[PDB]
Amino acid sequence: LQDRLFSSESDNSLYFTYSGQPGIQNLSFKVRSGQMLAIIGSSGCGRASLLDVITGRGHGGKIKSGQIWINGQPSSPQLVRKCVAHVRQHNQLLPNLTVRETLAFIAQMRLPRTFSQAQRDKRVEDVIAELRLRQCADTRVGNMYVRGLSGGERRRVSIGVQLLWNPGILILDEPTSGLDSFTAHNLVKTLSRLAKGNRLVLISLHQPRSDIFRLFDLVLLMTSGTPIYLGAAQHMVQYFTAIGYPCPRYSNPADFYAQSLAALFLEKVRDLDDFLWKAETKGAVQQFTTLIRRQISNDFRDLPTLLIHGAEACLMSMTIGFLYFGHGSIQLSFMDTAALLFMIGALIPFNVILDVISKCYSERAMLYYELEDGLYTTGPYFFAKILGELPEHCAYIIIYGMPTYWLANLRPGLQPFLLHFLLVWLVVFCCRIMALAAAALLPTFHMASFFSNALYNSFYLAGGFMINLSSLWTVPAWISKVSFLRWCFEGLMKIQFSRRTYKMPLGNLTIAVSGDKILSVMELDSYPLYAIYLIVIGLSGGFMVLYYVSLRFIKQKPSQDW
């Protein structure tokens, strides 16, 4: 097995006193910038929890007893995210980027403004080559659905994501799980390699089996929230020869599980040792760009989704259009032409909602980004995504909004077209934000995708066409003023079909004389040509603020749903 080491830097280590949590019982630690400690506890002893407790992030029900100390200080959720690197079982790497990229792009956010570019570039490689991601270098990462990349490698990459501050501590949750024993060795030995540097390494392996066992430096074996005992690889074999060991394996015993003045001196001494233990020890803008670059890159190198969305919109436009086809014998019936103008607005929601809820919700990444500290929300991500979609969203709109217009023969030339389009734009865009807000604040794809479809089914009724508007409770009467679906319709209607423009409404033989009067007769002259843009861009505001809040104050956490 080939080569030794290209990274390492120093310093911190780790320290404990009598813990307890609903599941834990009186721990005490040796953890020293160079040892690797494998926690080899039973199946769910607060074991996969343990590391998360040590970070501060506790599932179980908050700690009962204890004290936690790092290198030479207390513990703190604000502290840990500056010292310690955590590697989960969960991977959250963007499908369509190369290893080199997925590193560089985090490097640019975690390495300080002061660093040179050559520094970032060389640091990336200085990681890649210590983890021997030799020929993964410029190959895409996410096996998720390109299925063009190894797992054994993938893990090492999501580890690498964390080694870009060459952190003195390193905590890995069950890293082997999934890999083949063949490779497990070759990973855990790389973890040991890392460890030989001035890295402190923490592992948790519930079914480690013998072979991986042999590779442990330090071991901690616990059954259901008590430590059976701490010790090195070899020593354990012997130490439980206070109660006599067997033929099979090292985890068998896991299954089997001041006073005298003499001691008083030892009590003192450990204290004395103990002092010695510590004694030896003793920018947004920039972020923002990065985010949109990475976010936009992947999303653009995703073709499959991208073709669909185009199709997904395209076809609606096609049909809507044909269905109200404005040329040929049949003539658009002002009765009907309103309908279209409403529909073109309050149809696409029922796709787009699900379209963008789907994405935001299939992002948990951001949680781990929040907690790990990659991104703010001050000038940072709230802007990250809202702009990130935009270019897609423009095509998405244009593909959906132009053809309909022509098919259904709306007012000629140009000016109207663009006022039309431009509104559809702000309507749909308002709607995207609405979704984002809905999604970020609620807590489940299904849930957000309810709140949304209720909030939408509630706006279409308010919309002019399907219910005539004027005649209403105050409760809609007020709401209608807030309904982007309605404003779309009045807008389009005002721009298209009335205004100082003139029409020929007609049945059977007719081709009659009429004008703006029509809209005055319809309750819709109420607000003017150009007000409406402002109303919807304002509406946007409301949702935008709901998104900025829901993000800034409220977590998004993982859901299994879609």
Partner: protein, 585 residues
Amino acid sequence: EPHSLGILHASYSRQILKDVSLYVESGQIMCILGSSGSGKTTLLDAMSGRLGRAGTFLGEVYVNGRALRREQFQDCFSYVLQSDTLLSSLTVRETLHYTALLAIRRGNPGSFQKKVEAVMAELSLSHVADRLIGNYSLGGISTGERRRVSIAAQLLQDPKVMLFDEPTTGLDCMTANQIVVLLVELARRNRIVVLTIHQPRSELFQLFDKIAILSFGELIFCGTPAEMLDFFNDCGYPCPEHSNPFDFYMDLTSVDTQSKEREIETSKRVQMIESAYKKSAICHKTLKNIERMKHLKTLPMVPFKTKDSPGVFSKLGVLLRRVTRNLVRNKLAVITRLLQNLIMGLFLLFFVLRVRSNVLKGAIQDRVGLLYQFVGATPYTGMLNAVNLFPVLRAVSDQESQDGLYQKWQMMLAYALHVLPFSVVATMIFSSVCYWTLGLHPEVARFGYFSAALLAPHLIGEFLTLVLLGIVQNPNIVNSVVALLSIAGVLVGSGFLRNIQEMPIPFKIISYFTFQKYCSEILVVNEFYGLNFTCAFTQGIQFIEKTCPGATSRFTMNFLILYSFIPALVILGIVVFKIRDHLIS
């Protein structure tokens, strides 16, 4: 009392299983460990008859005198899957009562349960017998215990030869062992037991009559643990203490590919280790024993597994009683079936208020929208119903039918059959409340019609969604699509939004193919037969004509057609499901 289960030179196709051969007697246990490359699972599945594919199955299996024939496997084996999904809102004794009552025709629905008791008490679960089975999260049947029940269902068949896939996997220190035990006990009760075990402990190595290794569908060692601990050292490479004998042996047994170097080298090793006891005395011996059983006729001299599980006509009747039982003992669910439809009508009622009819200001236009929404929601409620409830039943039909209990459609029929009551109440709840509050021509009869006109769509949604849920297997897609369907539908297929008669060529054709049309053109006529609005238009017919002129007269029929769809959909369903048993292996 010695039972005979052997295999000679068995193989499979793209040729994943190669000239394997193995001997077992009743009361023994078989432990198959398969490299991540495996092959193991594939075989175990194969033998239970799960499929018979493009490619082939070489060899033959010798079971207690005679050879097995491909057409009898499922008869003379029993199968326990990698998981054990069970209907989350019943009791153990009920799920078992239904599996049993379905599997066999004998004494009575009272005595059946008594048989059940022997199984529950033989498996030591009598003590939870009559509790909420639960999902692990909902109800608290033990995540260990549930596994147990799954086994129970196979024992109602009274097999003496049992096949268990990965059955330790997905458990804990305590529980795993507890389950393993029970396997072995079954072996104590004069049975044959076969296992495919992924990651077990070092403790359990020593609990197995016969342990045997597969690599890339190629057979290697088979025998007593002691026998392995010897004969593998006959091949060389003794496994030290502090190595996990059970696990270590496998590491050597499988080639793998961290490089071309590690790769080629190892494959040679596993080849040599294979040939080593491909030749060896023991591998002769084991073979001879499978040659022994034909050669001898001895006391057991028999195979065995169940008799008559008949009347298909009768069979699903049970499935219904089960399903209705499920769906009823689930407060969560029921409430919605009945109620949401109403929610629709309230939610509208709240915006629309009552039908202003005095003026024309808010007269036809408020109603058009109303009917529209009903016709384009009452199928939505259908799928909302289906997509949410059905998958469990669908997938349970899947895992169940494979063991051989009821053909895939049986179930889909059943679901489809029970909804009737619920949906039909829903429609009434909805209608009774809303129709009058909105007060759109209220003579009871014409209410009566309006309540039949909106029952159909609310089923059509259900059964369409159903059909699709047999073809498409990822519900949340089905629930997007069916929406798009059942919305698009209304746009083209009720006059309302584009005066159907007036619309351009092709759509016109489409419309005639949608239930929507043949529903709307009811509701419009039913609710306008004749009325008088204050003021464009004036009368009730003058609108009827504008949108759907041939409706007035055709009404009588329209119903005929509107209800026409719902037999079709379900009939089609049957076919989709009848088909679908081939689709997923």
